[PDB]
Amino acid sequence: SMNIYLVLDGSDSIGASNFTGAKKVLVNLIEKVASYGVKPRYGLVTYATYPKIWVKVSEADSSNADWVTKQLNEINYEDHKLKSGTNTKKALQAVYSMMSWPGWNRTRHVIILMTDGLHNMGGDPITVIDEIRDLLYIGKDRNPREDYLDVYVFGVGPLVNQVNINALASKKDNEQHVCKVKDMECLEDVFYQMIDESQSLSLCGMVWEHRKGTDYHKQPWQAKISVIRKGHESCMGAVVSEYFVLTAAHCFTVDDKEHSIKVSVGGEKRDLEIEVVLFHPNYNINGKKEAGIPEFYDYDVALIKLKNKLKYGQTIRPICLPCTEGTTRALRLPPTTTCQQQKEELLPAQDIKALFVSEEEKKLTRKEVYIKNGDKKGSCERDAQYAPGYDKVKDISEVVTPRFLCTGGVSPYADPNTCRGDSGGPLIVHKRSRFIQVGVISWGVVDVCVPAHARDFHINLFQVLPWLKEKLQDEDLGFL
Numbered sequence: 453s454m455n456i457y458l459v460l461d462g463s464d465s466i467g468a469s470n471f472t473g474a475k476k477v478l479v480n481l482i483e484k485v486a487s488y489g490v491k492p493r494y495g496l497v498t499y500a501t502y503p504k505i506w507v508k509v510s511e512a513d514s515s516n517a518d519w520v521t522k523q524l525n526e527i528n529y530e531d532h533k534l535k536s537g538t539n540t541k542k543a544l545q546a547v548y549s550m551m552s553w554p555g556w557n558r559t560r561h562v563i564i565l566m567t568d569g570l571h572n573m574g575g576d577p578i579t580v581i582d583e584i585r586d587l588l589y590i591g592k593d594r595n596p597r598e599d600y601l602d603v604y605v606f607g608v609g610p611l612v613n614q615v616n617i618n619a620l621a622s623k624k625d626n627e628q629h630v631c632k633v634k635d636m637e638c639l640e641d642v643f644y645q646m647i648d649e650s651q652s653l654s655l656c657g658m659v660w661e662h663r664k665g666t667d668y669h670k671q672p673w674q675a676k677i678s679v680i681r682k683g684h685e686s687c688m689g690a691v692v693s694e695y696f697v698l699t700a701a702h703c704f705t706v707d708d709k710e711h712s713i714k715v716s717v718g719g720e721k722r723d724l725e726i727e728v729v730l731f732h733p734n735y736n737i738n739g740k741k742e743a744g745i746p747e748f749y750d751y752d753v754a755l756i757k758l759k760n761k762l763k764y765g766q767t768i769r770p771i772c773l774p775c776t777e778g779t780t781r782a783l784r785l786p787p788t789t790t791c792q793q794q795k796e797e798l799l800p801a802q803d804i805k806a807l808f809v810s811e812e813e814k815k816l817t818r819k820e821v822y823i824k825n826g827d828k829k830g831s832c833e834r835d836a837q838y839a840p841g842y843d844k845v846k847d848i849s850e851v852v853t854p855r856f857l858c859t860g861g862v863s864p865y866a867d868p869n870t871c872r873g874d875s876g877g878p879l880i881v882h883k884r885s886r887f888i889q890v891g892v893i894s895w896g897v898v899d900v901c902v903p904a905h906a907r908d909f910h911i912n913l914f915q916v917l918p919w920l921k922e923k924l925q926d927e928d929l930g931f932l
């Protein structure tokens with residue numbers, strides 16, 4: 453159990469712009485905390501001469517991040533009256549009241565005060581902190597229970613009194629509880645002191661975003677694949693579970709032997725050994741030559757089962773898959789959500805903002821593109837005609853089957869195009885600070901490694917769910 457008390461100074465010394473800026477920090481915090489699957493009870497207070505309580509931890513809705521965010525958004529600087537005064541002592545007493553009891557010992561408390569440190573009214577605020585610690589029985593039995601309280605102070609503005617701010621903040625070894633708001637490094641650090649990573653390792657679509665993170669931290673699901681032959685092939689893939697990596701079928705051949713295939717994840721020097729490669733039963737690169745289709749990429753998906761079971765860390769995590777319980781929670785949706793609903797949410801009828809990862813000279817970069825899934829779709833699909841060996845395809849809708857997603861082009865924006873090596877990589881949708889794989893990079897219209905018809909086609913994972921559900925039925929992924 454965890455309660456987070458947002459206390460924001462709204463007196464004269466703060467000002468409209470910075471008061472707004474302060475809310476932003478709080479809005480981002482609420483958002484980042486929620487993305488970790490954590491649901492604390494929130495307290496929202498503003499203050500000047502007196503405090504104004506906008507949210508109390510006891511309200512049922514206090515634990516609904518969307519609601520609390522809404523409230524915080526509706527707060528207007530001018531809403532708080534009597535700005536001539538600043539009584540931080542009182543503001544803290546309003547927090548006290550929320551903790552006051554007219555399983556208490558198992559609830560953690562985090563106070564986040566945003567002020568410039570200049571209280572010109574009331575007594576010394578430290579008093580209330582003392583009262584609070586007393587109330588929570590902290591620092592009594594040398595069982596201290598120091599872990600149950602955290603007082604963070606975010607100094608707002610240019611004219612801050614560092615002494616007072618330092619005075620109220622918690623004082624814990626190896627930790628920082630004071631941060632100037634303009635300092636983003638400090639604010640970033642606070643977050644990781646507040647939330648326990650360990651509790652979110654089993655979460656799909658998670659990313660450690662800290663500034664010190666590497667390429668593997670930023671793309672934890674990313675898996676590089678090598679095939680030694682003839683020419684050596686290179687492909688990307690995604691970790692979907694501790695035993696499986698999802699990729700493109702055309703990256704292999706029934707002639708490639710298990711041992712000639714190696715997988716690399718998490719920025720590790722070593723390579724991994726696979727047990728077997730599972731191609732989608734319907735994949736047949738030669739099944740449409742007669743219809744004028746040399747290479748046929750319908751159902752171009754494959755699941756590589758590793759010999760050894762992976763362990764999730766900050767450099768190795770699974771990505772979320774369509775229509776699973778992981779995606780529902782990642783999307784913060786009720787347990788009654790359907791596959792169809794997830795689809796309407798992840799893939800709406802329009803230009804969908806998505807991304808894919810590409811290796812650019814040792815470094816992994818994110819390539820933002822748009823999925824033409826609206827009235828601009830059909831147009832994107834037709835461009836397939838300009839593809840090598842497709843100039844005589846009877847009906848083009850025969851190559852661009854109902855399994856493909858279409859990206860690339862000049863509108864709505866100049867999308868970048870996949871390069872040789874990206875095949876098999878995940879086509880992702882970023883929502884609620886989480887990452888959802890909606891496709892598998894399959895093939896492109898043009899080799900741009902540009903023309904308005906340089907398009908890229910991906911396998912819509914929604915169109916192969918029966919297969920995924922079947923092959924991953926034991927990976928504890930909870931498909932719907």
Ligand SMILES: *P(=O)(OC(C)C)OC(C)C
Binds near residue numbers: 871
């Ligand atoms: P993929 O790596 O990349 C295309 C989709 C551009 O293609 C095979 C030849 C590896």
Ligand SMILES: [Mg+2]
Binds near residue numbers: 463538570571
């Ligand atoms: Mg003031």
Ligand code: NA
Binds near residue numbers: 522
């Ligand atoms: Na709401």
Ligand code: NA
Binds near residue numbers: 591592593594596
């Ligand atoms: Na003690």
Ligand code: NA
Binds near residue numbers: 649650
């Ligand atoms: Na950990």
Ligand code: NA
């Ligand atoms: Na480490």
Ligand code: NA
Binds near residue numbers: 780781786
């Ligand atoms: Na669920």
Ligand code: NA
Binds near residue numbers: 795799912914915
């Ligand atoms: Na669909």
